[PDB]
Amino acid sequence: TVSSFQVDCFLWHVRKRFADQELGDAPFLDRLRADQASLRGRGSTLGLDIETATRAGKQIVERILEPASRYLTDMTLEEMSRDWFMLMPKQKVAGSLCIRMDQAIMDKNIILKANFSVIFDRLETLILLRAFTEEGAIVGEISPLPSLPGHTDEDVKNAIGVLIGGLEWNDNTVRVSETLQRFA
């Protein structure tokens, strides 16, 4: 736990300069004040001096220091936070994507929007994809899963094809975003 105190004193000193120069922030200054108060309290019960602590924090932190992507959005944050429900649900998991749709839709023109990253000429990772009807109704969703594996473009295109097939079954004309038309 002494290492945590070393990092604490070192980070306090390196944060001192931010208030020493830039626009600063009154809560930031109060945080620094209460910080150094608690750090004096620690150094009292730990015994060691701060001049013998920041030097150790330097060598304890410096070792922790370390492909040109963008971000396209077809949906707003609201368009991905909106609630919904599938009356007759039809869902599964594929690789690392949760596919769901509503089977109770028919003869509806559907539009697929998506928000995701992009590298070079193709996708990298999908944040969310939902299916809307021309009358503004959510019917399908391809959500990412909290898995360490992840996903790339091939299985993403496969999931989109699965969704399009499941929708096109019930006489539903289905089209994708011009973005997905360009990248999938």
Curated annotation (Swiss-Prot):
Gene3D superfamilies per the UniProt record, alphabetical: Influenza virus non-structural protein, effector domain, S15/NS1, RNA-binding
InterPro entries reported for this sequence: NS1, NS1A, NS1A_effect_dom-like_sf, uS15_NS1_RNA-bd_sf
Motif Nuclear export signal per record, residues: 119-128
Keywords for this protein: Eukaryotic host gene expression shutoff by virus, Host cytoplasm, Host gene expression shutoff by virus, Host mRNA suppression by virus, Host nucleus, Host-virus interaction, Inhibition of host innate immune response by virus, Inhibition of host interferon signaling pathway by virus, Inhibition of host PKR by virus, Inhibition of host pre-mRNA processing by virus, Inhibition of host RIG-I by virus, Inhibition of host RLR pathway by virus, Interferon antiviral system evasion, RNA-binding, Viral immunoevasion
Pfam families registered for this protein in UniProt: Flu_NS1 (PF00600)
Assembly behavior: Forms homodimers and higher-order oligomers. Interacts with host TRIM25 (via coiled coil); this interaction specifically inhibits TRIM25 multimerization and TRIM25-mediated RIGI CARD ubiquitination. Interacts with human EIF2AK2/PKR, CPSF4, IVNS1ABP and PABPN1. Interacts with human DLG1 (via PDZ domains 1 and 2) and human SCRIB; the interaction results in the translocation of DLG1 and SCRIB from the cell membrane to perinuclear puncta. Interacts indirectly with human LIN7C via its interaction with DLG1, the interaction facilitates translocation of LIN7C to cytoplasmic puncta.
Name this polypeptide is given: Non-structural protein 1
Native organism: Influenza A virus (strain A/Blue-winged teal/Minnesota/993/1980 H6N6)
Lineage: Viruses, Riboviria, Orthornavirae, Negarnaviricota, Polyploviricotina
